[PDB]
Subunit: 323 residues, 4 copies
């Protein structure tokens, strides 16, 4: 099924989405951004993710411009944005009512949209009571600025707290968690999220399926120019890649590449298909700095049929990290 | 009583309404559409039903144009529309919050109205949780896009689930089910709906009282040109008419025609009066492809006084399908 | 206390108000209407009552014009309107959600106001479920078309049903009943309403304190020209006045007039002061067809200090109708 | 921590704010007002407090003009206003629904803002039921005219009543009490408010930290010209200052001044730092009639590090009023 429900909700998303972290308003030109969105949409992708923090609001401006220039029906799109870091002032960050309302409004203005389909808490906020946050998310939904809301990088326990508060005060529960998932980061999505889906219907929209591009194997011989790890502000990622653990995972990619070759697909295709083997994952958010990557990555769908129980066991043997 | 309450609600509808399936924006010209609406309204009909799916939104455009051109008071009209199929994109169908809000908005824009009196779920949606659907219907009512909501082609059990959810979360329950009812399709309206009316006050607004025109007897000698069953896209109905069961019901119409003759009315008049003999039916939605049919059908009201216990028993004997 | 709380609510009304039944848009010219309102407002009256039914919406147009021409602060006024009969179509009457929303909107448009302070159900509606009515009143309050709501001519039992429904579904209860009260119609206000005020805080705003002018004594020798009972459409009142019971109450007025003379006030002043002796009555709605009547009637306040236990017992002896 | 949460809420305020009582639209010129706000904002103060009663709405006009002229981001500001006395008409005062909605609207218009961050009940209203007041505050929050609400000069018991009502009817509780606190008025903030913070999360935003300027010592030799106590309308404060108790507290200031000298700070710096020693106080609202006072007072932050347990015990010994 190319389209599936986002969690237990009635919202149907393509099993792949396109995100805008690093790229839109940042690494890539607005023309390249339009090309990516066009290729995505034309291949049936309906799901597009952004954040007020991405390129200091510029990702939102670019994405919104593209939607307006292309004239696509709003009802054919699922646009998601994430709130937490909205500026340098003390009151421009967090999940307070003030910042959720203010942040979402400013995002909608940059997007040139009346609403997003899903507004996410971009991370948890230990400085704001959960009740305030859930009331605030309910309020923006009830005011028609969002259709639904979700969490990102919250613990299962914090998600269930949101649910508890919604049920105690008759507010709207979140429908999705946006969680990291790839071959080297599996536990939350494979173990915790299933339990949460079965108990309160929260779905999983996953991110960094290539671990920021590491899974492509491109860092085998160091840091290529123009790679994410080469860019100003991503020394943290350069450090991860060049860590002992980074090199240990690079070694595993060589073994995985052999499986890809046998399937006649690329390692990224294999890695993204692997993420979707899981029917509990509603959608995998793709990142791409160029159209060739995006077109390749969308081919992961054609790999899904080849992912037998024996291939999956072979991958688990290589990775050594089944949770 | 020509006017009656739609269910337990305070909304008073004429016991006949005029629908727009097949005809408006489709089979008939906009001029014929205006003629029908004018004849209806002038005879005291206040109830007009349409759907976002009818003629791909054109039925709504035509109906809305007529209201605006005639200048009729909005407060004198009961306009109903039905949401489910709103386009070809994945997210343009169903009873998700996204589609209910989006679908109803687009319908209101086509209708050139600020609100409908009743928004219906056009069919059930196994892909959307009932809670989401009822919250969404509550939301459009609370935002002033609809006064009330209803269901169509839902089981008694699904209607009661909507009621359960409304009472559990203090949302708005539906006030009406729009169900098929005619001499050859009786069980839901005669058996189930009464129980539902008594338990949770949901009323019945019925449709296809002539079984798409079959009850007129016009298909006795095959498929007349210009008949609904002759039109592009209605081969399904041609197939029903020309089925063994279609011919078995045609044979019964000959016997019913004898009763009509004795009452000095037409078979359609008899059939529509028969539907209204039931005080549990709030209104019967008429269809008409021309004004003569509509004018004839409205004469069913004059037949109602002649429908004795003995006539009704004679009809049950002929039909052989009392549930 | 010239000003008092309307029931248990925080709304403070003058102990006299000015109503618009018969007069505004009807019996009196718009100039006379402006004169009355000006005299009222200038004497500290803040409370002005009207209805969509009064002179077919013209009372509302006149009252709204006067407010706009005078430039009075909206925050200094307490405007009340009453919904039930809003037109000739089936759906233009009653306390359905459709009619409450539609009726109040049209009233606000005629009044040229964004909201009324109090919207009243003008009478009870046996054809609309109480839940719908209370939800609808809650909705117009929550949408900012009214600040509060009330009932008129409802039984204590129906008022308490409204309260029950508000508490069961967390809706807004009514704050006031608008009830008839004068020397010949006492039971509801003197017996029932006190109990209702103590149990659920509902106050009493009373009407026809002169029994449509009968209490002035003007009908002693028949029906004077220009009197309310002389006007087209008030034969019912002529019939009451000229009934055996009408004449029995006229005879009592002669005895009451003797008490007025001893107090050095007019019979209407005595009658209105008598209505206000009751601290449970929040305000008495005055009617006046000319400014002399209004100015006289406002003088009732100066009579209140003279209304001893012995005077009140003398009046009860004359009336013979203490409940 | 210069910034802290306002109570248990997610709203983060600077530990000092700037108020507008007496000064804005009143004692000081609009130019001086802009200077004060600029100095405050530039030093990281985000919290600005006003009232519809201050200078009959002029404080609000001045504050709003300054915000608009400076172009400061709305999301970087925390604006608070207080409702109770909004005019001379009977219905222009109190915490009725009518006055809260009307008062807040008029304030927002004067401020030229779409919303305030916090709307306060400026005092308690024994003439309005708590339920009405809390429903009304919930309503203006839900309509987007305020983000949060608070109380001012309410007893702990009345605050907890607001909380009870919010929880019983699923309304929004208040997040803060605005209470007087200074070296001569300690009991409510030091004893009661802590208990309230721990039980229902209500924070404390304190006012008159210099007891209207008395704490500066400026009244040692009588009433200086241009002092608050010299102004038309402040004879009450002149009377306090020149009372036996006023002189008893003046004598203590001489002893406190010795502590200030040893710390190398001014008495006002000492007094404001003393108010903030308390982590339960979220913010202290400053008043200043000139920029030198404001700049001095902001230096209280630099005194906070010097406030040892032994200094605090010395101050308690001098004051003799530890509660
Ligand atoms: N909720 C959250 O906190 C959160 C956090 C992170 C991401 N996300 C979402 O998830 C989306 C995807 O995350 P991600 O961008 O980190 O995804 P990813 O797939 O892990 O990394 C994408 C990056 O890898 C490289 N790449 C992609 N396909 C490739 C291919 N076929 N061959 C070689 N290199 C390839 C590109 O980087 P180069 O520059 O090296 O070419 C591309 O920008 C984001 O846009 C965002 O919407 C959400
Ligand atoms: N909720 C739902 O899913 C749903 C589904 C179906 C319908 N409905 C509603 O119900 C309305 C009525 O349904 P329907 O149109 O199927 O009603 P119907 O009465 O069963 O069929 C009407 C059709 O029968 C023919 N006809 C009508 N009167 C006639 C007469 N006196 N003599 C000969 N033929 C006559 C006409 O067809 P010809 O073209 O043959 O002349 C006319 O278009 C619709 O417009 C719609 O609003 C709702
Ligand atoms: N909730 C409801 O169903 C309802 C029903 C009725 C009324 N009300 C409200 O109550 C208001 C007052 O009712 P009402 O008008 O029936 O009040 P009322 O005091 O019983 O009757 C007023 C009429 O009596 C005459 N009058 C007044 N003062 C007089 C005086 N000093 N001397 C001689 N005649 C005098 C005038 O009639 P003439 O034409 O004879 O001069 C005047 O129009 C109405 O406007 C309406 O707002 C509400
Ligand atoms: N919720 C409420 O009922 C309520 C009530 C009162 C206040 N408040 C809030 O609290 C804010 C502060 O209150 P407040 O103005 O009474 O505060 P305050 O600090 O007690 O008094 C400030 C006044 O003291 C003098 N002053 C300030 N700093 C000085 C210094 N360094 N040296 C000498 N004199 C100095 C100035 O008066 P001079 O004119 O003498 O120079 C100044 O206007 C108000 O603006 C208002 O926002 C709220
Ligand atoms: Cl928490
Ligand atoms: Cl995560
Ligand atoms: Cl990573
Ligand atoms: Cl379900
Ligand atoms: Cl609730
Ligand atoms: Cl059906
Ligand atoms: Cl059929
Ligand atoms: Cl009822
Ligand atoms: Cl009454
Ligand atoms: Cl009468
Ligand atoms: Cl109270
Ligand atoms: Cl205080
Ligand atoms: Cl003081």
């Amino acid at each position: 099924q190319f389209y599936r429900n986002l969690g237990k909700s009635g919202l149907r998303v393509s099993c792949l989405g396109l995100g805008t972290w690093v790229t839109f308003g940042g690494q890539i030109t607005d023309e390249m951004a339009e090309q990516l969105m066009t290729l995505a949409y034309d291949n049936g992708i309906n799901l597009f993710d952004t954040a007020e923090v991405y390129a200091a609001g510029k990702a939102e401006v670019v994405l919104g411009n593209i939607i307006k220039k292309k004239g696509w029906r709003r009802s054919s799109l699922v646009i998601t944005t994430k709130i937490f870091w909205g500026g340098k002032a003390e009151t421009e960050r967090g999940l307070s009512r003030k910042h959720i309302i203010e942040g979402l409004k400013a995002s909608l203005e940059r997007l040139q949209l009346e609403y997003v389909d899903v507004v996410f808490a971009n991370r948890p906020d230990p400085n704001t009571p959960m009740e305030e946050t859930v009331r605030a998310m309910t309020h923006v939904i009830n005011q028609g600025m969002a259709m639904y809301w979700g969490t990102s990088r919250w613990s299962s326990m914090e998600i269930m707290e949101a649910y508890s508060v919604a049920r105690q005060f008759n507010l709207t529960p979140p429908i999705c968690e946006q969680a990291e998932y790839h071959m080297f980061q599996r536990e939350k999505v494979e173990v915790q999220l299933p339990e949460l889906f079965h108990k309160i219907g929260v779905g999983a929209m996953t991110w960094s399926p290539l671990a920021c591009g590491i899974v492509s194997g491109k860092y085998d011989s160091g840091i290529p120019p123009y790679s994410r790890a080469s860019l100003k502000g991503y020394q943290w990622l350069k450090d991860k890649i060049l860590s002992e653990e980074g090199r240990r995972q690079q070694a595993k990619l060589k073994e995985l590449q052999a499986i890809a070759e046998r399937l006649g697909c690329t390692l990224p295709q294999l890695a993204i298909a692997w993420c979707l083997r899981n029917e509990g994952v509603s959608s995998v958010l793709l990142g791409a700095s160029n159209a060739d990557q995006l077109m390749e990555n969308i081919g992961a769908i054609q790999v899904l049929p080849k992912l037998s129980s024996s291939i999956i066991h072979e991958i688990d043997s290589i990775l050594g990290n089944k949770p």
